[PDB]
Design a protein around this ligand. Structure first.
Ligand SMILES: COC1=C(OC)C(=O)C(C/C=C(\C)CC/C=C(/C)CC/C=C(/C)CC/C=C(/C)CC/C=C(/C)CC/C=C(/C)CC/C=C(/C)CC/C=C(/C)CC/C=C(\C)CCC=C(C)C)=C(C)C1=O
Ligand SMILES: CCCCCCCCCCCCCCCCCC(=O)OC[C@H](COP(=O)([O-])OCC[N+](C)(C)C)OC(=O)CCCCCCCCCCCCCCCCC
Ligand SMILES: CCCCCCCCCCCCCCCCCC(=O)OC[C@H](COP(=O)([O-])OCC[N+](C)(C)C)OC(=O)CCCCCCCCCCCCCCCCC
Ligand SMILES: CCCCCCCCCCCCCCCCCC(=O)OC[C@H](COP(=O)([O-])OCC[N+](C)(C)C)OC(=O)CCCCCCCCCCCCCCCCC
Ligand SMILES: CCCCCCCCCCCCCCCCCC(=O)OC[C@H](COP(=O)([O-])OCC[N+](C)(C)C)OC(=O)CCCCCCCCCCCCCCCCC
Ligand SMILES: CCCCCCCCCCCCCCCCCC(=O)OC[C@H](COP(=O)(O)OCCN)OC(=O)CCCCCCCCCCCCCCCCC
Ligand SMILES: CCCCCCCCCCCCCCCCCC(=O)OC[C@H](COP(=O)(O)OCCN)OC(=O)CCCCCCCCCCCCCCCCC
Ligand SMILES: CCCCCCCCCCCCCCCCCC(=O)OC[C@H](COP(=O)(O)OCCN)OC(=O)CCCCCCCCCCCCCCCCC
Ligand SMILES: NC(=O)C1=CN([C@@H]2O[C@H](COP(=O)(O)OP(=O)(O)OC[C@H]3O[C@@H](n4cnc5c(N)ncnc54)[C@H](OP(=O)(O)O)[C@@H]3O)[C@@H](O)[C@H]2O)C=CC1
Ligand SMILES: CCCCCCCCCCCC(=O)OC[C@H](COP(=O)(O)OCC[N+](C)(C)C)OC(=O)CCCCCCCCCCC
Ligand SMILES: CCCCCCCCCCCC(=O)OC[C@H](COP(=O)(O)OCC[N+](C)(C)C)OC(=O)CCCCCCCCCCC
Ligand code: SF4
Ligand code: SF4
Ligand code: SF4
Ligand SMILES: [Zn+2]
Lengths: 342, 176, 48, 209, 115, 155, 96, 146
């Protein structure tokens, strides 16, 4: 639009930021933070949801009256996609699953749905499109999750050439399935790590940093057509990271090696769950996939975000995993884990 | 004039001491408390069968707001803004301009039903009986935004409840 | 009402509607005033 | 006093209060600055701030005063005065079925002696005055906010404090707690200029400037 | 004229003693505050915040104003030691949810009309 | 068929939750007096299965009956957080809806919906005991139309 | 009368409607726009003009104390009809 | 009654010429960058400014300082005033030195080439008040206007 919405106010709850945003997948881990930041500054947010309306309740307090609008949509219904994007200026795709259901598989979730959203968004006149890929998305990956990420990333780059693609590392936060996942292995006694976790390197990134990069990409005109890699400030071996998680949670760490083939047999066992699986074959592959180093892509520092170290925020995530004896332990009680030099 | 509530001296004759001894040992004044609640068990309860029965109200009841019309269909409100000036909560926002026919009418008549204290001062101050509080009180909503009434919502309320609203004003306007 | 019916008016709803909150017929607030400041529209022909 | 709509005067009480006002000013000339009686028979004693403990002690203990009850204690903020605050003591005498009002003054920085020694009732009234006006009471057994929120900055009942304040609270899901942010109002409070440009009461006309 | 009733301190030299006494109480309290309230900040961040609050009023030369600041500071300390404050009240000194507002003229120019 | 079964199971749990609503014993201001009259014999909320319980850990519904001030707001969020799910909030009265008579006060939260999610807004100042009971029966109909299991069945 | 804008949205009696590009139309998706179908400007125009024999006529809106403050309308002009400033009813003097 | 003109034909966004040669909306950053690029590439007499009739003193001095940073002095106005002699060097040369309230003390007023009824309606009202109350003698050289 030649004369778009003009911002007003001082960036508060009752202000107008001029951002009309449709956020697909707003009811997940990354969605609640994005919707919070958009609504925190007075933005019209359309939140299409597939879940029960009860599951969207925590989003209602995130915006002033009339700023958060909820709609029904179906990933395989283009008409419902067009209803929820035909008035927006930016569209943010945060749709993803870490496991395959009987009705949706990684191909359907990470290739078909993103393409349909981008295709309809282009026809509707949307100008800004933000798509969340994965850092380790490559076509030659043992993880079917990471193969579909690569295919979907290029489909979006073709359907919406001016799209902004963001490739985060393993994000960690209060509701994450990364640090909570490791601290929840205490239920099984010891932590099985392929190659004892000394052949894998991780570069986790804080949730708020990823959120502030997404918000800064909406406001920055230089992010059109770019592909960003959001990574943390430090790289860790899988062993030192998991050892740190158990140190902050104050729980006994009893790691042992486990062959790759056996670990995939465990993943197959836990896939039979008709609910959110505790683990899967794909989750084992991603956990043990070394984080890529992509110096040719812009990162958080370009969008204007200082990456938060994992050592300043692990306790915010891992404190609830402690027993009463250790709840009150302060942040300056576990020495930082060994970092692989830059 | 005053009276004492707990200034009494108990009798000390042997028959009065024994009476109090029997009360202490046989729980007579506690058995008497049981007899009072037993009586209620055999009375008809005071419960009404809502929503099939409704608690009694009166023509003065102050419920949901409504904008009324004259019998010809013309709006009674002429944008005087007396309701806006007297509203204790500042729940009323009004804008007005000459209508296409030159009539003094409103272009905005909003009542924030979450600021309003349902006091009726607006209908007292209206010189044309335009804004009234109707008899409706069952208008709960599932979202906050639905309680920010605009002019269209208030005219719809008036057209919906006019039959009842007119009869209540007919029953109470001589007291006003 | 069967012994003393209400006065008839041609604007009174003939069909009564119950509480519509939570349905597609619910009420959505909006501003009923027109735009106040009119923006300048540049000419569509180049000056050159 | 036969007029139905007009409030009748009680000139017996007016004389009695005027007589007793002189009586107090004669006994405490060191502190009494001005005495007056209103047209509805309320006696006011205006004192120097140093006389808070002597004046109230006399009015509570003297056999001809016996004001054993502190009805209320409050402050009024008048910015145009050099001493913007006006501490008001409303006392009740059960023995003589009478009431008296004692008034003094102070500013943002000058303390006023605490009257808890004279009236145990003043403990919370002085906390409220401090909390809502920022007037410090010396030697108070424990002075701190009573009505405002913890960490609240400023004194709401000052005339220069805005009606809606400076901060407001919401819940933020990122930090999982209630936060405080600068106030933004969806609808600004609408200031009404109600004063009529015509004088209402000639009896109170102030001399021209 | 210029002769005023004091509060606690008769001169700045006496007043500064109360400032130092208050600073030592806050300094010793931060480790307990970061522990009881289970704050996700460090003892260094808390003590830096205390220093930031004190230097904010380093330009005062009126002893009475200094006396009130110490009085207000001791009320804050009492509220924190006794846990009358909640985690929300102790974190309001850090403004974690306030987006950084612009400071330079150009940034203020682009976003609005305020000076 | 699997869709038929999950539909009937959904009707069962939805029925159980709306027939056994346990409000937390939580009232703030004048609006709590009108909430007492809904428990009084004339309306007898207990006959609908609605029973007050003081512990937030045994409550299914929070009725924010009265004014919410900035001082009390952290307490409200805490007790709301300590409610096991599923949990519904009913906002009663102008103060709890949008600030009401005290919208423009330095010390009042302009609506409880800034602190917690709200399922039903009951208007009035105060709503009559019969108007709060309408909101409770409107909440029960809202629970009756939940599709938790059906939505799970086709994920 | 109630008329629809080209995009389909109804126009209110105040002449309010959202433009085709206004993002605020999103609030009506899955819901409806509340509009009162009884435009008061049309209904008053349907009332007949009342003929009277006097130069000055009074209107209280009908219903006595249930109407509006009694006002007196001058009917000397022949070109136009005197109109009640409160309720819009028109009066005309018989044969000037 | 001319205030209602403040609600129409208002400029509300920066604009620039696109490839087609039409004005199109743009951001403040983009608009001030183009104007800054050209101002850097020119100096001296190549930069000039004209001030309209509704311009304020604060804007006038800021623009004069800006053009003086490129050694330009072509700060013009749409309203002509002779520069011959003292020009604008002396304020008395281009002022109403008797003051509006001084018309009430004058006894002869000579109007030269001006229709004060429409050029300064309140100044003309002041003359009529002196005409009515002080028996002022008014003479005019120009078109016989009412
Ligand atoms: C005026 O000033 C003010 C106050 O001052 C008074 C205030 O206070 C407040 C603050 C206000 C509030 C906090 C709210 C006030 C509201 C009220 C309604 C209080 C008024 C008074 C009352 C008497 C209300 C209700 C209290 C009582 C005591 C009534 C007694 C009746 C009851 C039904 C209560 C419970 C009784 C019984 C017998 C048990 C029922 C309980 C259950 C949990 C149900 C059964 C339990 C089960 C576990 C299920 C059974 C089956 C199982 C377990 C399975 C078995 C079968 C298998 C197959 C396994 C304010 C603002 C105020 O301004
Ligand atoms: C002639 C030969 C000489 C010997 C003859 C002796 C014959 C008489 C024998 C003595 C009779 C003693 C009766 C029992 C007394 C025990 C109670 C007592 O101690 O009283 C004092 C006590 C306390 O009385 P008190 O509070 O006033 O204090 C007494 C002592 N002073 C005054 C000094 C402090 O009373 C109670 O026990 C209160 C009861 C608690 C409330 C319970 C609810 C009431 C329930 C009522 C229904 C009961 C149904 C029971 C039947 C169930 C059937 C299965
Ligand atoms: C359900 C079916 C209906 C029948 C159910 C039984 C109802 C029994 C309870 C109601 C009794 C009526 C109330 C009443 O009259 O009490 C007042 C009367 C009088 O109350 P009083 O306190 O004023 O005493 C008067 C006489 N003086 C003061 C001298 C003591 O109370 C009694 O007399 C009750 C005495 C019975 C004592 C029984 C205790 C021992 C129990 C042994 C196990 C059995
Ligand atoms: C002991 C614990 C046992 C646990 C095992 C499961 C026990 C299930 C049997 C109990 C069924 C609940 C009673 C049925 C619901 C009812 O009566 O309400 C009627 C309700 C009443 O309608 P209403 O709720 O709208 O009433 C509103 C209030 N009035 C009417 C007064 C205005 O009608 C319905 O049919 C609603 C849907 C009921 C859904 C019941 C589905 C059960 C199917 C069985 C699933 C498999 C079972 C395993
Ligand atoms: C004494 C009585 C004791 C026994 C009581 C028996 C109760 C009888 C009820 C039987 C039905 C239980 C179903 C309710 C399960 C709880 C639930 O709603 O979870 C929804 C969940 C919701 O999962 P979801 O996938 O839709 O979403 C979860 C993710 N968030 C939180 C983001 C929304 O769905 C299920 O888990 C499916 C339930 C399968 C059917 C139940 C199987 C076990 C019991 C029957 C065998
Ligand atoms: C055989 C050897 C197996 C080796 C271990 C394989 C890895 C399995 C890791 C389990 C991870 C479970 C998990 O991630 O959490 C799932 C569940 C919910 O997670 P929670 O932290 O409780 O809260 C989430 C709120 N959204 O949290 C849980 O329910 C805890 C896990 C329960 C296990 C029960 C046995
Ligand atoms: C090809 C490989 C696969 C081969 C097949 C495997 C089949 C399953 C074998 C099960 C039995 C394995 C027994 C445990 C293996 C040894 C684990 C181990 O040594 O790692 C613990 C390690 C020791 O410390 P270290 O790494 O040497 O020093 C630097 C640490 N920062 O780090 C520590 O300091 C923590 C000390 C932990 C001590 C408990 C060891 C685990 C207990 C058994 C698991 C239950
Ligand atoms: C008549 C009823 C027979 C059936 C009752 C069976 C139940 C027995 C248990 C209850 C006790 C009653 C029996 C005690 C004697 C009562 C009759 C009596 O005392 O004579 C009446 C006479 C009149 O009393 P009066 O003169 O007005 O004032 C008392 C001044 N001494 O009073 C007197 O002046 C005489 C002297 C009074 C003082 C005597 C000591 C009495 C208290 C001792 C404890 C009695 C209870 C012991 C048993 C406990 C187990 C129940
Ligand atoms: N560790 C991490 O968080 C990583 C995140 N990413 C990517 O970010 C994106 C956001 O995921 P995240 O927030 O982290 O975790 P979540 O799984 O919690 O977010 C998933 C969101 O997408 C929705 N969703 C999933 N499948 C469907 C479907 N068939 N149809 C409609 N909606 C669906 C979900 O809705 P509903 O709940 O109603 O089913 C939910 O709102 C994902 O694409 C992920 O691949 C990339 C790097 C690391
Ligand atoms: C072969 C076979 O019986 O398997 C059963 C199949 C196997 O699921 P699948 O086909 O491998 O995929 C499943 C996942 N999907 C389709 C999304 C890819 O699961 C089911 O039907 C569910 C059975 C659940 C068993 C519950 C046991 C829980 C015990 C509790 C211990 C703590
Ligand atoms: C002690 C050991 C416990 C074992 C685990 C028990 C709980 C889980 C069982 C689920 C099995 C399953 O598979 O049911 C699910 C199947 C259909 O499967 P689907 O759609 O392919 O699911 C794939 C995953 N989705 C759904 C997310 C896409 O639905 C049915 O036909 C029935 C489902 C309801 C349960 C019926 C039982 C009724 C009991 C009534 C009691 C009063
Ligand atoms: S009832 Fe009272 S508070 Fe409500 S709109 Fe009317 S005057 Fe205002
Ligand atoms: S509703 Fe009545 S009081 Fe309010 S503006 Fe209209 S005519 Fe005036
Ligand atoms: S809404 Fe009305 S009755 Fe309820 S607390 Fe507020 S003022 Fe009191
Ligand atoms: Zn009329």
């Amino acid at each position: 639009l030649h004369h778009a919405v003009i911002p007003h106010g001082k960036g508060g709850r009752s202000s107008v930021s001029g951002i009309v945003a449709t956020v697909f997948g707003a009811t997940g881990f990354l969605g609640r933070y994005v919707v919070n930041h958009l609504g925190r500054m007075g933005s019209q947010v359309i939140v299409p949801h597939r879940c029960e309306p009860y599951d969207t309740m925590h989003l209602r307090p995130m915006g002033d009256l009339g700023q958060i609008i909820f709609m029904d949509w179906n990933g395989r219904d283009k008409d419902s996609i067009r209803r929820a994007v035909e008035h927006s200026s930016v569209v943010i795709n945060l749709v993803g699953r870490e496991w395959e259901t009987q009705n949706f598989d990684f191909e359907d979730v990470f290739v078909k749905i993103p393409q349909a959203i981008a295709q309809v968004s282009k026809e509707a006149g949307v100008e800004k499109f933000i798509h969340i890929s994965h850092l380790n998305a490559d076509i030659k990956s043992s993880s079917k999750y990471l193969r579909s990420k690569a295919v979907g990333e290029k489909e979006v780059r073709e359907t919406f050439p001016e799209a902004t693609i963001i490739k985060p590392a393993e994000i960690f936060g209060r509701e994450d399935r990364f640090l909570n996942y490791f601290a929840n292995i205490r239920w099984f006694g010891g932590v099985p790590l392929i190659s004892l976790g000394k052949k894998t390197v991780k570069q986790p990134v804080y949730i708020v940093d990823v959120t502030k990069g997404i918000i800064n990409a909406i406001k920055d005109p230089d992010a059109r057509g770019k592909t960003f890699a959001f990574v943390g400030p430090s790289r860790y071996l899988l062993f030192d990271l998991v050892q740190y998680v158990f140190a902050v949670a104050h729980r006994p760490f009893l790691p042992y090696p486990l062959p790759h083939f056996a670990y995939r047999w465990i993943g197959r066992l836990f896939e039979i769950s008709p609910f959110e699986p505790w683990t899967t074959r794909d989750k084992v592959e991603r956990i043990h996939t070394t984080d890529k180093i992509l110096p040719h892509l812009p990162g958080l520092e370009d969008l204007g975000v200082e990456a938060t170290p994992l050592e300043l925020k692990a306790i915010e995530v891992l404190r609830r995993h402690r027993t009463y004896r250790w709840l009150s332990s302060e942040i300056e009680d576990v020495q930082p884990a060994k970092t692989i030099p830059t | 004039t005053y009276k004492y509530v707990n200034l009494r001296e108990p009798s000390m004759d042997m028959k009065s001491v024994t009476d109090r001894a029997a009360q202490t040992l046989l729980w007579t004044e506690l058995i008497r408390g049981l007899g009072m609640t037993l009586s209620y068990l055999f009375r008809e309860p005071a419960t009404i069968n809502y929503p099939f029965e409704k608690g009694p109200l009166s023509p003065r009841f102050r419920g949901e707001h409504a904008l009324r019309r004259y019998p010809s269909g013309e709006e009674r409100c002429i944008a005087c803004k007396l309701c806006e000036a007297v509203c204790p909560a500042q729940a009323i926002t009004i804008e007005a301009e000459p209508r296409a026919d030159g009539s003094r009418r409103t272009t905005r008549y909003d009542i924030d039903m979450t600021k309003c204290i349902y006091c009726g001062f607006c209908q007292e101050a209206c010189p044309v009986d335009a804004i009234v509080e109707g008899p409706n009180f069952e208008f709960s909503t599932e979202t906050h935004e639905e309680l920010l009434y605009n002019k269209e919502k208030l005219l719809n309320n008036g057209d919906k409840w006019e039959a009842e609203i007119a009869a209540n004003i007919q029953a109470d306007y001589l007291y006003r | 009402p069967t012994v003393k019916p209400p006065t008839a008016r041609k604007f009174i709803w003939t069909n009564h509607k119950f509480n519509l909150s939570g349905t597609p017929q619910q009420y959505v607030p909006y501003s009923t005033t027109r735009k106040k400041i009119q923006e300048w529209v540049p000419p569509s022909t180049p000056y050159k | 006093d036969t007029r139905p709509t007009v409030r009748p005067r009680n000139d017996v009480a007016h004389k009695q209060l005027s007589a007793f006002g002189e009586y107090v000013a004669e006994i405490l000339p060191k502190y009494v600055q001005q005495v007056q009686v209103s047209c509805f028979n309320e006696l006011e004693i205006c004192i120097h701030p140093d006389g808070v403990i002597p004046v109230l002690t006399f009015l509570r203990d003297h056999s001809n005063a016996q004001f054993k009850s502190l009805a209320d204690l409050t402050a009024v903020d008048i910015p145009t005065r050099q001493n913007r605050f006006e501490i008001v003591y409303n006392l009740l005498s059960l023995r003589f079925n009478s009431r008296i009002r004692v008034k003094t003054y102070t500013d943002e920085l000058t303390p006023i002696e605490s009257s808890v020694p004279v009236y145990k009732a003043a403990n919370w009234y002085e906390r409220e005055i401090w909390d809502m006006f920022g007037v410090f009471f010396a030697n108070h057994p424990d002075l701190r906010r009573i009505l405002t929120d913890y960490g609240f900055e400023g004194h709401p009942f000052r005339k220069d404090f805005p009606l809606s304040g400076y901060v407001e609270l919401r819940y933020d899901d990122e930090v999982k707690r209630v936060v405080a942010e600068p106030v933004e109002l969806a609808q600004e409070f609408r200031k009404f200029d109600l004063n009529s440009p015509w004088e209402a009461f000639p009896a109170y006309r102030q001399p021209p400037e | 004229s210029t002769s005023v009733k004091p509060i606690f301190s008769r001169d700045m030299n006496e007043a500064k003693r109360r400032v130092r006494e208050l600073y030592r109480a806050w300094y010793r309290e931060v480790p307990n505050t970061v522990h009881l309230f289970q704050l996700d900040i460090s003892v260094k961040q808390g003590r830096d915040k205390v220093r930031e609050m004190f230097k904010k009023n380093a330009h005062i030369t009126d002893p009475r104003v200094v006396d009130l600041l110490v009085i207000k500071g001791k009320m804050e300390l009492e509220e924190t030691i006794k846990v009358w404050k909640q985690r929300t009240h102790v974190m309001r000194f850090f403004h974690e949810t306030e987006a950084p507002r612009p400071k330079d003229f150009l940034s203020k120019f682009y976003v609005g009309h305020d000076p | 068929r699997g869709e038929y079964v999950v539909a009937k199971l959904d009707d069962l749990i939805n029925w159980a939750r709306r027939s056994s609503l346990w409000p937390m014993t939580f009232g703030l201001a004048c609006c709590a007096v009108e909430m007492m009259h809904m428990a009084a014999p004339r309306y007898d909320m207990d006959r609908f299965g609605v029973v007050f319980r003081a512990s937030p850990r045994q409550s299914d519904v929070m009725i924010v009956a009265g004014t919410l001030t900035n001082k009390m707001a952290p307490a409200l969020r805490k007790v709301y957080d300590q409610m096991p799910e599923p949990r519904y909030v009913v906002s009663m009265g102008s103060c709890a809806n949008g600030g009401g008579y005290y919208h423009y006060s330095y010390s009042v939260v302009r609506g409880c919906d800034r602190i917690v999610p709200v399922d039903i807004y009951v208007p009035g100042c105060p709503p009559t005991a019969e108007a709060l009971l309408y909101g409770i029966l409107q909440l029960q109909k809202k629970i009756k139309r939940e599709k938790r299991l059906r939505i799970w069945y086709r994920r | 009368g109630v008329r629809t804008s080209p995009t389909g949205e109804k126009v209110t009696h105040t002449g309010q409607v959202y433009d085709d590009g206004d993002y605020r139309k999103v609030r009506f998706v899955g819901r409806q726009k509340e509009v009162n179908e009884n435009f008061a400007i049309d209904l008053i125009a349907e009332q007949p003009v009342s003929q009277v024999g006097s130069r000055v006529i009074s209107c209280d809106g009908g219903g006595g104390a249930l109407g509006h403050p009694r006002v007196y309308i001058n009917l000397d002009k022949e070109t136009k009809t005197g109109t009640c400033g409160y309720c819009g009813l028109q009066f005309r003097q018989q044969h000037h | 009654f001319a205030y209602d003109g403040l609600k129409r034909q208002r400029l509300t966004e920066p604009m620039v010429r696109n490839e087609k040669g039409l004005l199109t909306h743009t951001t403040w950053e983009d608009a001030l960058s183009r104007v800054a690029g050209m101002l850097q590439s020119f100096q001296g007499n190549d930069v000039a400014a004209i001030a309209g009739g509704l311009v304020d003193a604060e804007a006038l001095i800021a623009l004069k300082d800006l053009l003086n940073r490129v050694d330009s002095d072509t700060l013009c106005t749409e309203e002509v005033f002779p520069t011959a002699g003292a020009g604008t060097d002396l304020r008395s040369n281009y002022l109403l030195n008797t003051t509006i309230a001084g018309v009430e003390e004058a006894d002869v007023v000579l109007l030269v080439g001006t229709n004060p009824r429409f050029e300064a309606p309140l100044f003309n009202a002041r003359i009529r008040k002196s005409w009515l109350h002080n028996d002022l003698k008014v003479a005019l050289i120009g078109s016989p206007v009412d």
